[PDB]
Design a protein around this ligand. Sequence first.
Ligand SMILES: Cc1cn([C@H]2C[C@H](O)[C@@H](COP(=O)(O)O)O2)c(=O)[nH]c1=O
Ligand SMILES: Cc1cn([C@H]2C[C@H](O)[C@@H](COP(=O)(O)O)O2)c(=O)[nH]c1=O
Ligand SMILES: [Ca+2]
Ligand SMILES: [Ca+2]
Ligand SMILES: [Ca+2]
Lengths: 204, 206
Amino acid sequence: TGLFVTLEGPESTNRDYLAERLRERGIEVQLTREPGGTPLAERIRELLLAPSDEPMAADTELLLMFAARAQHLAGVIRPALARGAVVLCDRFTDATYAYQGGGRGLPEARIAALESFVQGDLRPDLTLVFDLPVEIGLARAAARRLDRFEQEDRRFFEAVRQTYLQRAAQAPERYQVLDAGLPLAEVQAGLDRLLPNLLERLNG
Amino acid sequence: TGLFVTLEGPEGASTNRDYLAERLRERGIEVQLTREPGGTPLAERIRELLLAPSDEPMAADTELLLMFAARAQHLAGVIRPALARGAVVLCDRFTDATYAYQGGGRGLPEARIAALESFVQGDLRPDLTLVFDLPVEIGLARAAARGRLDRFEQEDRRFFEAVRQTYLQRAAQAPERYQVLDAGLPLAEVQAGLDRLLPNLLERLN
Ligand SMILES: Cc1cn([C@H]2C[C@H](O)[C@@H](COP(=O)(O)O)O2)c(=O)[nH]c1=O
Ligand SMILES: Cc1cn([C@H]2C[C@H](O)[C@@H](COP(=O)(O)O)O2)c(=O)[nH]c1=O
Ligand SMILES: [Ca+2]
Ligand SMILES: [Ca+2]
Ligand SMILES: [Ca+2]
């Protein structure tokens, strides 16, 4: 039956730390990320992130995101959950609501229609939102060539951050919001702290 | 304004699209020629993913969504703008092929294809769809004559028979927007079958 956990936030050792703590307990952990997660899904990821002179329609972006999600769900996520694993997935449909919804301005109802179409009843059991002011995360990206999303403006990323926060506030039972700026030791302490509940979810 | 015409049929083999175009151009009509999946740089990249054989099985939902992603890009970038300027769009393959290949061939429910059709296209449908019907064997041989078989061309005989039957069923349910042409006739009988077709086209335009 497993547990489907997703990790979200604006633009790594967090997931690894959580994975190590779970494995120590004999729990199988499947690490993955979106868009991507399978060879085909990664090829779709490439098209989505590559800058181009041709404008990508909002609907195209949304449909490609969901095409990669369908492949990833079928190939990686569902099988893992069927083995009883905890899936730790970097980004999922919350990112679609934030980026394609908040950022692009596509209506929530249309994103929800595809969510249902692609996922059926399946939703993450828990979503960890690593929150951070937009400028700091874009500077982090700027510090390492920016892809199609990374090169968007302030309005865009502010919509992204606030969409994440609003969805978490609306269904607090499904989310935990963390401050992604804390000292490493203090981040890990927060990860330790959320672990008992994660295990209660799995064993529930 | 404008007119949206799609050209469909069983797998196999461009010539007719380019021909009808000539009859229309000589009348002073603007014609925009195109094809799916593809039609734009990104849509062509999506075509390449869809056609490339792989040892990873592509989920049916993935195939359907990539097909409609390319369609969405193509509609926004090519089709709607052309119709807006009053051009005739002549498009090799469109959503009928989704019903035939993803529905008939893959076995995806018609309802799910229709859901995405409405999602992507809203109310928009082709004004006229020409189905170039032909025994499956002939078309497959044309497609196989040269080059490597792509993801679809690698399929089995039953898959392509299902494709053909779906096209015929759909056309028979809406005779007003479909014309079925025998692609297994002498070029003269089919070029002239296309000739006998122009007056209807031109009228649909005006
Ligand atoms: C999963 C997902 C990611 N994205 C974006 C966020 C990132 O800018 C980009 C690549 O993700 P990444 O930053 O974690 O590597 O994909 C969406 O726009 N919608 C989605 O549904
Ligand atoms: C437009 C479209 C094409 N196809 C397939 C049929 C062909 O095998 C393939 C390439 O088209 P083509 O043979 O005309 O070059 O695309 C679908 O499966 N669904 C669709 O919606
Ligand atoms: Ca990024
Ligand atoms: Ca060939
Ligand atoms: Ca072919």
